[PDB]
Design a binder for this molecule. Structure first.
Ligand SMILES: CCNC(=O)c1cc2c(-c3cccc(Cl)c3)ccnc2[nH]1
Length: 154
């Protein structure tokens, strides 16, 4: 039993756009743009919607780069996160109710203020490798189990 989510990373040649999450789950960490896929939209549609809702930005194209499954101990629903990349943004990022956007240099990624699983998979994305990951968390700080591999098809 799993719930569909999207995550979009805006990755340009020498920088990445992250947003400080201002409220809800994982508030106080720098995240990519995403959320729950709704009834009546495709996964990709949901990714675009979340990006626009959270940052103002629209894009030409999204590229599938990964899938991560998250289990949180004591929560019934697994999270099935479809991860996308883009380097064809249209607009300037702006702050929303949910996210405060900021550009980071690729050697200045704020890992200490990110989800701890990010240290494992985010480098694969920077290296342009497609991946499947699974992370079992106890609360929001502790990884109990994980798997991570590269794949040919996301
Ligand atoms: C490189 C930036 N990484 C992330 O943006 C990132 C997000 C998450 C989430 C998460 C929680 C709620 C909704 C969604 Cl879509 C994801 C859970 C664990 N690790 C994460 N990492």
């Amino acid at each position: 039993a799993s719930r569909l989510y999207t995550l979009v990373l805006v990755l340009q040649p020498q920088r990445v756009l992250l947003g400080m999450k201002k409220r809800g789950f994982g508030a106080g960490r720098w995240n990519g743009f995403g959320g729950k896929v709704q009834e009546g939209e495709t996964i990709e549609d949901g990714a675009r919607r979340e990006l626009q809702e959270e940052s103002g930005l629209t894009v030409d194209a999204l590229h599938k780069v990964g899938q991560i499954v998250f289990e949180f101990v004591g929560e019934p629903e697994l999270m099935d996160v479809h991860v996308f990349c883009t380097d064809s943004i249209q607009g300037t990022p702006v702050e929303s109710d949910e996210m405060r956007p900021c550009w980071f240099q690729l050697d200045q990624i704020p890992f200490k203020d990110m989800w701890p699983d990010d240290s494992y998979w985010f480098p694969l994305l920077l290296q342009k490798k497609k991946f499947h990951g699974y992370f079992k968390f106890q609360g929001q700080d502790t990884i109990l189990d994980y798997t991570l591999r590269e794949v040919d098809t996301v």
